[PDB]
Amino acid sequence: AKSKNHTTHNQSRKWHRNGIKKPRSQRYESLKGVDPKFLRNMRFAKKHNKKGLKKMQANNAKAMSARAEAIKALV
RNA sequence: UACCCACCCGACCCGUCUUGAAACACGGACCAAGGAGUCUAACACGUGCGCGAGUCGGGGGCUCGCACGAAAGCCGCCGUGGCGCAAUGAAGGUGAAGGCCGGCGCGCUCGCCGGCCGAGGUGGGAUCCCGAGGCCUCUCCAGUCCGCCGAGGGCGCACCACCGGCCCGUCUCGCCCGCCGCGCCGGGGAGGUGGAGCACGAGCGCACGUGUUAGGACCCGAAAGAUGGUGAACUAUGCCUGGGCAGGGCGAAGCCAGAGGAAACUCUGGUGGAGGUCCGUAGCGGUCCUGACGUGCAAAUCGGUCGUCCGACCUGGGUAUAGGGGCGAAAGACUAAUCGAACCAUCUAGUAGCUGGUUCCCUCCGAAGUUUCCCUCAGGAUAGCUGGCGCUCUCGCACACGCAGUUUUAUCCGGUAAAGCGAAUGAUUAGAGGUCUUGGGGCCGAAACGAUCUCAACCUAUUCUCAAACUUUAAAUGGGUAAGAAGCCCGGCUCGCUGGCGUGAGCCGGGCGUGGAAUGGAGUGCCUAGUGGGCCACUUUUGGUAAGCAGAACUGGCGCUGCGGGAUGAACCGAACGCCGGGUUAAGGCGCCCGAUGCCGACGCUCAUCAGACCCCAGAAAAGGUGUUGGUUGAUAUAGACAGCAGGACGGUGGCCAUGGAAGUCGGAAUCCGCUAAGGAGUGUGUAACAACUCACCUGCCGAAUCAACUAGCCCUGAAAAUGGAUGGCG
RNA sequence: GGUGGAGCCGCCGCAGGUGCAGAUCUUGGUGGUAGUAGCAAAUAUUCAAACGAGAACUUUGAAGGCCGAAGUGGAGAAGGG
RNA sequence: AGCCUCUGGCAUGUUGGAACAAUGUAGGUAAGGGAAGUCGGCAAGCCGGAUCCGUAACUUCGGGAUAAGGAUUGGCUCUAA
RNA sequence: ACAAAGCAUCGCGAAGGCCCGCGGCGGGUGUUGACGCGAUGUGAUUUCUGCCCAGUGCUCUGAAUGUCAAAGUGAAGAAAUUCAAUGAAGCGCGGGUAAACGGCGGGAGUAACUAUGACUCUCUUAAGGUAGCCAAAUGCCUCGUCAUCUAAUUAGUGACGCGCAUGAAUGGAUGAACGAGAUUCCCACUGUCCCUACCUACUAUCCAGCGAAACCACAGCCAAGGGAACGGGCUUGGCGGAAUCAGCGGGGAAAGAAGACCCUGUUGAGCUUGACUCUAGUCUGGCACGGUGAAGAGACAUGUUUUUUCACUGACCCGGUGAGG
RNA sequence: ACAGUGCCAGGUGGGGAGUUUGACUGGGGCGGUACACCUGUCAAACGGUAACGCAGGUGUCCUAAGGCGAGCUCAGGGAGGACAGAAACCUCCCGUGGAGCAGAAGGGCAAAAGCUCGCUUGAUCUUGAUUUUCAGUACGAAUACAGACCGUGAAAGCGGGGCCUCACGAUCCUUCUGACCUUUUGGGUUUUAAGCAGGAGGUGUCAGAAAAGUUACCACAGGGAUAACUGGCUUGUGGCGGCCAAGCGUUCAUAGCGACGUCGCUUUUUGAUCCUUCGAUGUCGGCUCUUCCUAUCAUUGUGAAGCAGAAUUCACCAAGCGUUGGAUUGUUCACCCACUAAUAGGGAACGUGAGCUGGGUUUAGACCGUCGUGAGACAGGUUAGUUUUACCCUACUGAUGAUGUGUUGUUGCCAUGGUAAUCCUGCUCAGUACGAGAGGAACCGCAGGUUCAGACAUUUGGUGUAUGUGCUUGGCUGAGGAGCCAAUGGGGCGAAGCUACCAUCUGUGGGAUUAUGACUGAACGCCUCUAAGUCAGAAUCCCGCCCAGGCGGAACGAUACGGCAGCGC
RNA sequence: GUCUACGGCCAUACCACCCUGAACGCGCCCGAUCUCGUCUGAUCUCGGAAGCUAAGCAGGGUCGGGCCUGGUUAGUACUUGGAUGGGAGACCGCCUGGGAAUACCGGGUGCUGUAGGCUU
Ligand SMILES: [Mg+2]
Ligand SMILES: [Mg+2]
Ligand SMILES: [Mg+2]
Ligand SMILES: [Mg+2]
Ligand SMILES: [Mg+2]
Ligand SMILES: [Mg+2]
Ligand SMILES: [Mg+2]
Ligand SMILES: [Mg+2]
Ligand SMILES: [Mg+2]
Ligand SMILES: [Mg+2]
Ligand SMILES: [Mg+2]
Ligand SMILES: [Mg+2]
Ligand SMILES: [Mg+2]
Ligand SMILES: [Mg+2]
Ligand SMILES: [Mg+2]
Ligand SMILES: [Mg+2]
Ligand SMILES: [Mg+2]
Ligand SMILES: [Mg+2]
Ligand SMILES: [Mg+2]
Ligand SMILES: [Mg+2]
Ligand SMILES: [Mg+2]
Ligand SMILES: [Mg+2]
Ligand SMILES: [Mg+2]
Ligand SMILES: [Mg+2]
Ligand SMILES: [Mg+2]
Ligand SMILES: [Mg+2]
Ligand SMILES: [Mg+2]
Ligand SMILES: [Mg+2]
Ligand SMILES: [Mg+2]
Ligand SMILES: [Mg+2]
Ligand SMILES: [Mg+2]
Ligand SMILES: [Mg+2]
Ligand SMILES: [Mg+2]
Ligand SMILES: [Mg+2]
Ligand SMILES: [Mg+2]
Ligand SMILES: [Mg+2]
Ligand SMILES: [Mg+2]
Ligand SMILES: [Mg+2]
Ligand SMILES: [Mg+2]
Ligand SMILES: [Mg+2]
Ligand SMILES: [Mg+2]
Ligand SMILES: [Mg+2]
Ligand SMILES: [Mg+2]
Ligand SMILES: [Mg+2]
Ligand SMILES: [Mg+2]
Ligand SMILES: [Mg+2]
Ligand SMILES: [Mg+2]
Ligand SMILES: [Mg+2]
Ligand SMILES: [Mg+2]
Ligand SMILES: [Mg+2]
Ligand SMILES: [Mg+2]
Ligand SMILES: [Mg+2]
Ligand SMILES: [Mg+2]
Ligand SMILES: [Mg+2]
Ligand SMILES: [Mg+2]
Ligand SMILES: [Mg+2]
Ligand SMILES: [Mg+2]
Ligand SMILES: [Mg+2]
Ligand SMILES: [Mg+2]
Ligand SMILES: [Mg+2]
Ligand SMILES: [Mg+2]
Ligand SMILES: [Mg+2]
Ligand SMILES: [Mg+2]
Ligand SMILES: [Mg+2]
Ligand SMILES: [Mg+2]
C-alpha cells in the first residue's frame, strides 16, 4: 500500500483558472502596524485641526480673493 | 417510418470497481410483478408571502350532534411566553453622544453654568438637481416655446475603503472630586488595548428549495455481545433393573499312581481345567485396497480383506448430570445431521472507514486525485478546483475605465549549464628546479651539505586530469517591481512626536488631463456537490544494471473524449465532435485489397542461398567484407613503370655474438665496404648446419596509366528457440 | 382495426409508498440442456389356462429355481396407528 | 463355519426386449522370466484341515510355538482293539 | 497418542483436606477416618535416578526496629480538620525443598615421528552433563567417517563421537511376550513388471415404456499482432457446407464454494501470561450480636486506658437417642 | 464470649470478566524512524518541491559560554635567545584570516562577534503589530516598535538571554505566585472552596489513546490498492557466443588454446519488479503421450588438424531417425553399475490431478530437539492423514449422411491433405593399405541382426462357458442308469475363434540442389569455383510407391406397361 | 601645485622595492612636575620644542606582482522554443532566437566632499 508522495502537477492550472489576482489596493490603507508614537501624536494633530479653523478660513478667502484678482487682472 | 429479404461500409457485451475492461476481472439462462435518498426534530443560507419595532402561536378559551368539521370563525386572551428590540465582564456590575457656540472655573486639550445643532469627517460613489456653451428652425433681425447634444458645476442613497467618536472588560498614567454619613466610601479624566458592541432598526411568522447532522436513516450484508428460556429419542459418563456370548488350541494350581533317593525331595505317566490366554462363529469394531460409490442405495453407505470375541465384553428399558454449563481411558471429543463452546424467541432494522445495487427525457455549466492536521495511509477534516444564486457598476444608446499564464522600455534579483583550477578549498600526473627542509636506504667515502646516486616529503617557476555535499568568473530560460488623476505643481493650517531653525506626518484650500504595444465589460458576497488510489509523453532529473521499475520538475495530454491517420491499439501525428448539402484542406497517403499517380514523373544507389521497406514502435552491437559506389591523402610513371614471362640475388665472409647448432637465416648487439647494375652481413622456405630454393635489390621482354593507406554510402558476414507466420496482406 | 364487458380521462391547483435490466435481488412462471443422464448390489425364469376392452408384470395349474431353520420361516417389545 | 436339502416362504428386490463395440465395475487364466514393477511387494498368491514326525535364537523360564523343516491323506476288502 | 498395573511425591485427625452452591444451621467425597479421602507427576519387569535452592515457586512455633488501613488512641484549632504515636496479614529479611518449575559453560601450553594429549595453567557460575546412549523418531554442516549388505545403495544394520541442539521419574539404559504401529534384508510366491493376451458376469450400446440435474451474457474452427502485457468475438491472414451417432478428455484459464494461504480492518472469537482494569473466592484487622466472675500487670496520671492470663454458661456452637436413670 | 454469621479495611487472586496489543513499510514479519525538529546537497540560478535519496546533527550545555565597556590580536611559519631537543620560556620579523567564535554543518565576524580585564543583571515588568511553518490556525522560534524599571559607557549608543539557521508541548487536572480582587448565594464575621491573571507538573506516536501475547482449532468484512504459482517487461546473476590480441603450444599468436580488456545474444538458472488473476486459473515430482527447437551426442555428406594408420579433438550443410536397462533417493538435481552408435541439451501455463499416482511439501492427531515463564514457534527432524462432476460447445477419433450430378447403378481419374523406415554386427576385402614396430583401415559384395511400421494364425504358445469330453468332492433325484445344484463346484486334455520379437510374413524409387569440391573464365595484358556461364553432390528438401478421396471431374449401363402411368428425343 | 582636520565611493587606492620632498602642517623627537597608565613613560595619559626628513606620509619610478577595464578566446561552449530530422544506441545536425569563461594580447593605476592652511 505505497502511494505517491507529492506533486505540483496540474496545480498551476487550478490556481490560474480564476486567474491569480494581485490584491486590490485602495487609497487610504489602514494605519494598523505603524509605530504607536507616530499615531499617539498624529491623532493629536488630527484632533486639534479645528482649533485654528478661523485662521484657515479667512486666509482661504485672502488667496481666493487674491486669485480672483489674479484671474481678473488677466482679464 | 415500421414487416421480411438483399447488398456496400461500419461494428467486440452490457452493468461495475478501476491509471486502464471485449477481457483469461466479477454480477447477468429467459419473462412477468415487487424493489432502494423516506419521515420527524434541530440548525443554516437562498427564495415567496403577511405584518413591520414589532410579530406570532401554542396551549387554553368562546362557537356542535361535524355531513362537509375532528374544519372554519372569534377571544383586554396577543403576550403569561418565545424570538427581536443592547452589549459587555469569570463575577460584584456597568451600560451606546457627540459636535458646536457663548458664559463661568486660569480654556489647563482639566472642572462647572446658559444657548444652538444633532448621529462626525475624507474618498469613491447608481445617481437626481443646476447648467456655460452649442444644434436647427425658408430671408435680416427681434423674440418667447420645445427638445437633442452638453464642457463645467451641486446635492449625494446602497455599498466598499479609511480616519474619527461612544458603551463594556483590562491596563497604564494622572487630575479633580461628592459627602447620609467616617472614606482601606462612591465619583469623574488622558492615553493604549480585549469585545460576537452602538454609530437612527429588520425582525417575527408562514411556506418551498438546497445542505449538514441526530434518528433503523438510500437499500441489502457480518464474525459477535446480552436476557430469558427448550433439549441426554443421538452421543458422553454414573447409577438401577433385565437379556447375551458356536466349536477348537495351549495347557497353570490342586490331585493320583509308578520310579529314584538315606534325607531334602527329584524324575516319569496321568489326572485336573486356571487365564484382562491363542485360533475362530454370533455380537461389537472399522485396518488396508487410499477398491466400489461419489447429482450415491446412503447429507458417510457397499464389497473383499481385517481387529476383538469371559472381560477395563456387548447390549434393552428406568434414572441422574444442561450451556462458560454438562460429560470426557483426553481427540477439544460428544451434547438429537450443529461444538475452540448448543438450539429457540427477543434486545434487533445490532454496528460497518468495507463489497453489491441505486428506476424518465431534453438543455446549459463542469471537476479532482494536490495543501496542512488526524491511531492518518481503503477514511475524514480543511485548502483548492465546481456549480447555482445573485448583486455592485461599466457603456455601442458617435461620446469607457479597468484588468490580464502577453511583449516591449527602464530597473533590481539570482549562483544552474558552461567555464576554471598558473584564483581559494579538495583531489591529482609528470618532469625540469630546489643540500629549501630533512630524512631512510645505498655506492664511492674512517667520516665529511665531500662526490655521485636514490627515494621520500616540502616548496620555485611549470605541466596532465578532476569535484553534487568546491568557486575567480558566469549564461540561456526565469522572479520581482515601475510605465501617473489614488498623479504631479502651488498656497495655508494642526501637532503631546522630532529638533539650535527645521523635520515629518496629518489635515483644509485652490492650479493643472489620454503618459509603452496588443487584448477584453469589470468588481464583489453568499450557499455549496464531487474529489482527496491517478496514469502517460517531450525536456530536466533522483535511486537502480535495467525494467511496461521506484521517485521529483515543467508543460502537455489520457482519466472526462469521440473523428482522420499510425494494419491492430488510452497516452503517438492531425484535429476536438448540434443535424445536414457544396467546396477545401491537415497528419498521412495514391500497384491490388483500398478512395488516390492508368505522371511517358526527375537524379541516382543497391541483387540479398535471412533483401529492403517510415516519429511512439516493437529490433540488434563491437568487429569485419579489392561486394559495388563515392570521396580523402599519399604514392609510382615514356630517364618508359605496374602486372606477366626470362637472368642474377653475389663477394670481403664459418662476419660477430652465440657452438646446441646460426657461415644471411632458433634468438640478439647489430651493421659497413668491395663487384657495383644489384644483392639486405638478409624476407622467408627450410636444413642440426648448409645446400638447394626463394624473396628484397637489380636486370631481360613488353607499351600507359598504376599503386597504397584511410574514409564513408548501400548489400553480405557477425545473426541461435521452441502450436505454422507475418514490411498489415498480397506481392 | 380487433376483444373486452363497466367504468374513465383533458385542463388549473394540491399530495405521494411515483417511472427499473442489474443488486449470487424477492416471489411466481418458463426454457436450452433432453427425450439426454438414467430405471445395472443379493444367481431365474418358462409353458399352458382363467379373468378380462387390454396381460412379459394379476390369478390357478405345471417346470425350473433361490432363502436353507445365526431364514426371505413362525410369534412378540418399543414405535406405528 | 461354508455348501446342498425337507418344513415353511418367496418371484430376483421401482421395468422389459434385441446385441456381445470401446472404456469400465466385479470375477477368472496365462508360455519364459521372476519385483527388473513402484514412493514402497499396493493387490494377489503362496501357505492352509487333520494325523505322524520334527523344532532354533532368545527369555521375565510362563513362553517363543501351529517356530522353522519334512512325510501321510481317496475308493475298496479286511483285521485287530 | 490416552489408559493402565507399578513407582513416586503432596494436603488432611473432621470448626479437616479437596470441592459444590445465590442463599440456609445448604450439599459432594461420606452407609466414609490415614491399608481412608483428595491433589499431582512418571509409566510393566530388570538395572539405575548424577550434580544445582543462584532464578521463579511452594513452604517454615522463623526475626517482622523495613514498610502498612479501617477503626482506634493523642495533640493543635472555633470546626471541617490538621499533625502525632502504633503496626496484621501479606509484602521486605532468614531457614528448608529439584520423583517442584527448571539449569548443568570458554580458554592455552605440555609425552620421542606427526597427531593426539594423561598432566599442568587461567576464567566464569548456582552446579558446570556424572552412569549411560547416539548421525537414534533427537546431527545444522550431511549422500558425517569406517565396515557390512549390493554388479551398483542419499536406503538398512554395526561401530566411531567436542553431541548445530542426547541424558537420567520434563525419567536414562535395557526388553521376553504382544502389535490391522514404523522401517530394511532374504526364501517362497506371483500378470507388479518385460508385454500384453483372451474368457465370464453386470453395464454402457440399440429398442418399448418412463424420465431427471448441474450449468447457460451472447456464444462456440485457427496463426500472428496488438490489447488489462496468454482472445471465441477485434486487425491481418488462414479458411467455413445442412441434421447427427458412439467415443474422448486438448481447450471453454469448464462446474462446484463472495479463496481456508497472504495483507488490510482501529471486525471478532478460542486459549495464554510478567499486558491494562476488575472481579468470585480465600487470608488478616476492625465493629456488631458479646455476657458473668476471677486474679494480675504495664502506660499515663497523682482516676483512666491498655488490658494479659485463668476460670463460668445463659446467648452461640457441635455430638447422641425413640431426648429413659 | 472464641468458633460463626452481619458490615467496613488491607492483602492475595488469568479461578472468572471486559478490553488492548501504533503508524510508516518495494507483501508482511523481524531491521530501521525517513513518526517532532536543524545544516550541506538532491533542486533543473525567485521561492517551493520526492524516495527506508545522500553527508550529517538535536532532545542540549551557559552566573557567563549572557549586557554593556574598554584593551589588545589569532592559526601557521622564519630567525634568534643557559640547561631547552620536532614541543616549555623569552624577543623580533612575516602573517586576509589558513585561528577562534559551547555543538552538526552552512553562512557571518579583525584597533571585531575572536582573546584579556571591570561593572553588572535587557535572561526583568507590560500591551499590541508582524515574520517563520500556514489553512495563511495554533505551538515553537524570531523581527521591528511603544510603555515602565534598570545595566553599562565621557558619550552617541547598545542591551528585554546566548553572532544567524534547531534545542521544544493543548484541553482537563495539579501545584506556586498576584490583587486590602470577585463569588461562597436570606443577612453578617471568620475559616474553606470556586473564579480572574500569569508561571510550573506532560503527552518523544512530539496538534497531545490510560494498554502484552498466541492461534497449525479458528471466524467475518474486504483486498489482485498487499505477497506465495504462470505469464509479461528487465537481465544483474546463470548459460551460450564473438572481437582485440600478451602468451601456452619443443620452434610457431590464431592446429588446438588464450591473459589484461571489450561487444552481444539467450530466457532451460536465480533475481529484481508487482501489470494480470484473492465471488480460488488446483501450487512438487513421477507415470503416460504428442509435438516442436537446435546452442549436434550418435548416424548421411563434408572441410580442419601439432590427421601416417588407428584413435581424436575443431568447424560447415543438417534436426531425417536415434538417445536405453538398473542400485540409492519424495526429489528435480545428483552418484554409480551395465549396455550401447549414442547414452546431446531443451520448449510446449516452469506441457500434461474432471489423465493417474499422493512419496514430498502444506490443515486438523501425535513424537523428539531448540526457543518461549506460557499459550505456542521452528525451509529443525518424524509417523498417521477423503484427490469430486462431462450428458453441454469446441478439437480430435471413428461413424452415418449432406447440396450438387435428370433418377439410379458400374467401373474409374485425381485436386488436396497424411507419409516411414532405422541403425549395427559378423564374414569377405586383410592381418592388406599406412607404420619402424606395437599396432591397423576403407569402398564393392555376402550373411544377418536392433529399433520402428504394416499384416497374419501355417506351425509353437496363450485363452477356452462349443459348459466338447473325461475325472472327482458335498448334496439331491428310493438304487442302477441318467442327471442336476454349490454367482463358471474343482481339476486333466481341448475344436473354433481372437492373440504374442512368445510363432510367422513384408518394408519399396527418382528429381532439384546445401555444405563442399571442381570446370571454362573475367574484373586485375597474370591469377582466381563466379562476376556472365557450367559439373559432381547428401539420413536434407520435393516427388514416387503407400493412405484418404473436394459444394471436383469421367466413362458407360438401365431408364419406370399398367391395373390408374409418366417421359426421351 | 599641495597639505591638515573630518570624510564618501572602498586596490585605478594594495604590495614589493627605487628615487625626491621648498613652507605650512603632519610626524619623528625631548622630558615624567601635575593628570593617567604600565613588569617597563615601550604603548596609553600628560609638560614640552633641542634636533631631523633617517622613516610613516606625500610625490614620483619599475618591459614589477595585484587589481581596474578593453581585445582575443568566439558567435566557440551552453541554451528558449521547433520538426513523422539523423543515429541500434550514445549522442549529433539544422530551423527560430539569446549568448558565456580561462590561458594569450592591450590600456589604466585612486576619484572627489565640506572646513581650514602653505606656495603670501
Ligand atoms: Mg489494478
Ligand atoms: Mg487477458
Ligand atoms: Mg469483487
Ligand atoms: Mg463485547
Ligand atoms: Mg476410496
Ligand atoms: Mg461415476
Ligand atoms: Mg437399488
Ligand atoms: Mg475499493
Ligand atoms: Mg544551488
Ligand atoms: Mg479513495
Ligand atoms: Mg359483471
Ligand atoms: Mg400512496
Ligand atoms: Mg416494475
Ligand atoms: Mg447361497
Ligand atoms: Mg405373520
Ligand atoms: Mg439379477
Ligand atoms: Mg422393495
Ligand atoms: Mg506368468
Ligand atoms: Mg524396485
Ligand atoms: Mg524404476
Ligand atoms: Mg496385501
Ligand atoms: Mg519367530
Ligand atoms: Mg514429578
Ligand atoms: Mg534428578
Ligand atoms: Mg529457591
Ligand atoms: Mg558423557
Ligand atoms: Mg540401539
Ligand atoms: Mg533396496
Ligand atoms: Mg547407525
Ligand atoms: Mg450414451
Ligand atoms: Mg483449468
Ligand atoms: Mg485505519
Ligand atoms: Mg476481543
Ligand atoms: Mg499486572
Ligand atoms: Mg482474559
Ligand atoms: Mg500497517
Ligand atoms: Mg527553478
Ligand atoms: Mg571592543
Ligand atoms: Mg524599552
Ligand atoms: Mg556572544
Ligand atoms: Mg446561615
Ligand atoms: Mg499445533
Ligand atoms: Mg490441538
Ligand atoms: Mg497487482
Ligand atoms: Mg513472476
Ligand atoms: Mg613461445
Ligand atoms: Mg506502481
Ligand atoms: Mg475452477
Ligand atoms: Mg547449426
Ligand atoms: Mg506443470
Ligand atoms: Mg487437465
Ligand atoms: Mg483430480
Ligand atoms: Mg504423505
Ligand atoms: Mg499435523
Ligand atoms: Mg529428551
Ligand atoms: Mg522450557
Ligand atoms: Mg602387420
Ligand atoms: Mg450313479
Ligand atoms: Mg541427383
Ligand atoms: Mg559453388
Ligand atoms: Mg548438377
Ligand atoms: Mg619617552
Ligand atoms: Mg619622511
Ligand atoms: Mg626620504
Ligand atoms: Mg602589471
- Nucleotides on chain F that have an atom closer than 7 A to a protein CB are 24-28, 48-51, 128-130, 145-147, 225-226
Cell 479667512 -> residue: A58
Of all nucleotides, the one whose C1′ comes closest to residue A11's CA is B370
Q: Please tell me the distance from the alpha carbon of residue A31 to that of residue A10, in angstroms, as a whole number.
A: 39
Q: Please tell me the distance from the alpha carbon of residue A73 to that of residue A67, in angstroms, as a whole number.
A: 9
Q: Is A35 helix (H, G, I), strand (E, B) or coil?
A: coil
A33 C-alpha to ligand 41 centroid (Å):
56
Resolution (angstroms) stands at 3.7
CA dihedral (A42, A37, A39, A35) in degrees, to 10, reads 140
**The C-alpha cell that represents A46 in the structure block:** 488630527
Region of A20 (left: φ > 0; alpha: ψ -120 to 50; beta: rest) is: beta
